[PDB]
């Protein structure tokens, strides 16, 4: 079931390969936009002492139960604030753990949804994610 | 480690043959006779490979097969402590700065700078050699 050229090693790690001249990562966004989003995540999380996360993919039919399922994959999920987006279903969800409750996220999470939605209507996915992370982390205190 | 010894013994055979051939061929029909610089260099290149090969050959016949000498050894044969490998040190750059001080002193022929550089070298080399052997301070 392992991809071609991938091997399970004696430590349990996977030793994988790429064809020469091909890429390992291949996210459909420009490198400098990815760097901007990475900085938004890092410095928003540092300023709020809560781990901010972003999901892109299919959110199902309820799309909030699925988002709560995805939040379990963020490290220390009790202290995390996930923004999940379905470009197809055109759905925006924010879900956070219990550690963040009462720290300013009830005011800021809908503001993050609005910030994302405004940029999505222009067809700017990564710009919407960056703006939403910026507003939600600026509204959470390290409490 | 028989291959390690064999490599140096093969080099030794070639170097000894080259030294003998060169000395004999320059003694006969070469102006001035034996060419002493090249003959000396070839003889002592032979000596270099001979010293290392004899040491390896003596070591090989002592210890039985290591896991890196064994054609179908398992990775787990090599389990255990390897040895001590220094995690960090700023003494190497101090030793090189000291030796460079003495070298600049010798280049410009400043005997006081040469003396200072040699003293720096001895202090830096002591610092390196003692780094993992100084005990706790005593009070």
């Amino acid at each position: 079931d392992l991809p071609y050229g991938s091997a399970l090693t004696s430590s349990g790690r996977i030793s994988a390969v790429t064809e020469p001249g091909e890429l390992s990562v291949h996210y459909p966004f420009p490198t400098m936009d990815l760097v901007v989003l990475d900085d938004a995540l890092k410095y928003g999380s540092r300023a709020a002492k809560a781990r901010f996360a972003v999901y892109i993919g299919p959110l199902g039919a309820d799309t909030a139960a699925t988002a709560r399922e995805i939040l379990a994959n963020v490290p220390t999920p009790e202290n995390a604030v996930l923004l999940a987006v379905s470009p197809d279903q055109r759905a925006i969800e924010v879900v956070y753990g219990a550690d963040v409750k009462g720290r300013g996220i009830e005011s800021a999470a809908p503001l993050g949804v609005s910030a994302a939605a405004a940029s999505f209507k222009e067809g700017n996915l990564i710009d919407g994610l960056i703006s939403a992370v910026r507003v939600m982390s600026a509204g959470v205190s390290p409490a | 480690m028989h291959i390690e010894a064999r490599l140096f013994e093969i080099l030794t055979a070639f170097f000894a043959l080259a030294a003998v051939v060169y000395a004999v061929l320059t003694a006969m029909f070469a102006t001035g006779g034996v060419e002493w610089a090249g003959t000396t260099a070839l003889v002592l290149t032979t000596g270099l490979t001979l010293i290392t090969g004899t040491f390896f050959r003596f070591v090989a016949r002592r210890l039985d097969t290591r896991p890196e000498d064994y054609e179908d050894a398992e990775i787990s044969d090599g389990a255990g402590e390897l040895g001590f490998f220094a995690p960090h040190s700023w003494w190497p750059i101090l030793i090189s700065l000291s030796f460079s001080t003495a070298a600049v002193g010798a280049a410009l022929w400043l005997p006081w700078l040469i003396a200072a550089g040699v003293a720096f070298v001895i202090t830096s080399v002591c610092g390196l050699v003692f780094e993992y052997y100084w005990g706790p301070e005593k009070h």
């Binding site: - | 070469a30 102006t31 001035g32 060419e35």
Partner: protein, 299 residues
């Protein structure tokens, strides 16, 4: 065409030079053939063994072809054995010395000009004899216990002094005058560091050493004859300091009777330039001119 294959080698003006040029052309052709084969093999696999779009499995994983490995060590050995044989033949012919040269020249290199002395002339037909050695001046150099076999390093006795000498100057290129058709012997000594005696039309050069005998250098070489008259540049070919690029000389090859007239003029007290004008030659060097003594265009 022999000029394109010679790659800028001069045609040569001595028999030894012509033999060396033939060896050069043959060796160039051999190396070009080997290079064409190897380059073609590189271009072939680069052109026809590139990964296609319709190959899913890896190529055949061969890594050993023993008969081919053995066959590809014998052929280059054969080519270098042939080249070594002809190399030995030509160097034996080029380094050959006859016991009776017809002109013996003393070449003295110094930093950074040349001095040419006429040591001896013995024409093969008896039409010209001249004894030019001046041993009453080699003895004036004796410096004498001494650091080296009783001698100080200022001994200089190994240098040769002659009655007729052409001395180079920063404003006059030294012109060495030689007869055509005659066996010429060159004895090379340096006054200080190592220089290089290169006449490109000789297709040959040798290093000019201080104290060559103590260094086991053979400082003597001959050309069997120079096959045409004319003027030929010579350059220093061993890095000797500041003015290594600016100590050139010229060889003027004239007919033997004109050489005799030139030597009579020099024996009559004439300088090199006026003795050359006396035999209807240009008085100064014509392949090269003196370098401006200004250190450059910014001065």
């Amino acid at each position: 065409w022999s000029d394109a294959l010679a790659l800028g080698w001069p045609t040569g003006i001595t028999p030894e030079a012509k033999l060396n040029r033939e060896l050069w052309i043959g060796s160039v052709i051999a190396s070009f053939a080997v290079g064409a084969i190897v380059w073609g093999l590189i271009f072939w696999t680069s052109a026809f063994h590139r990964k296609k779009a319709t190959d899913t499995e890896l190529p055949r994983q061969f890594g050993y072809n023993m008969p081919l490995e053995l066959t590809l060590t014998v052929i280059p050995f054969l080519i270098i054995s042939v080249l070594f044989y002809f190399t030995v033949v030509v160097q034996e012919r080029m380094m050959h010395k006859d016991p009776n040269p017809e002109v013996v020249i003393d070449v003295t290199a110094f930093q950074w000009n040349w001095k040419f002395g006429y040591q001896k002339i013995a024409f093969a037909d008896g039409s010209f004899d001249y004894d030019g050695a001046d041993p009453e001046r080699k003895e004036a150099m004796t410096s004498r216990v001494g650091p080296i076999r009783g001698m100080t390093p200022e001994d200089r006795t190994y240098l040769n002094f002659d009655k007729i000498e052409t001395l180079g100057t920063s404003s006059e290129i030294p012109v060495l005058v030689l007869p055509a058709g005659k066996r010429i012997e060159f004895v090379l000594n340096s006054a200080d560091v190592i220089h290089g005696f290169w006449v490109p039309e000789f297709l040959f050069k040798r290093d000019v050493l201080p104290e060559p005998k103590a260094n086991n250098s053979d400082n003597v070489f001959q050309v069997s004859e120079i096959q045409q008259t004319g003027a030929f540049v010579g350059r220093c070919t061993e890095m000797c300091g500041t003015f290594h690029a600016m100590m050139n000389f010229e060889v003027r090859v004239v007919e033997p009777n004109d050489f005799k007239a030139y030597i009579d003029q020099r024996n009559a007290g004439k300088t090199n330039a006026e003795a050359l004008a006396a035999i209807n030659q240009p008085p100064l060097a014509i392949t090269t001119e003196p370098f401006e003594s200004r250190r450059g265009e910014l001065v």
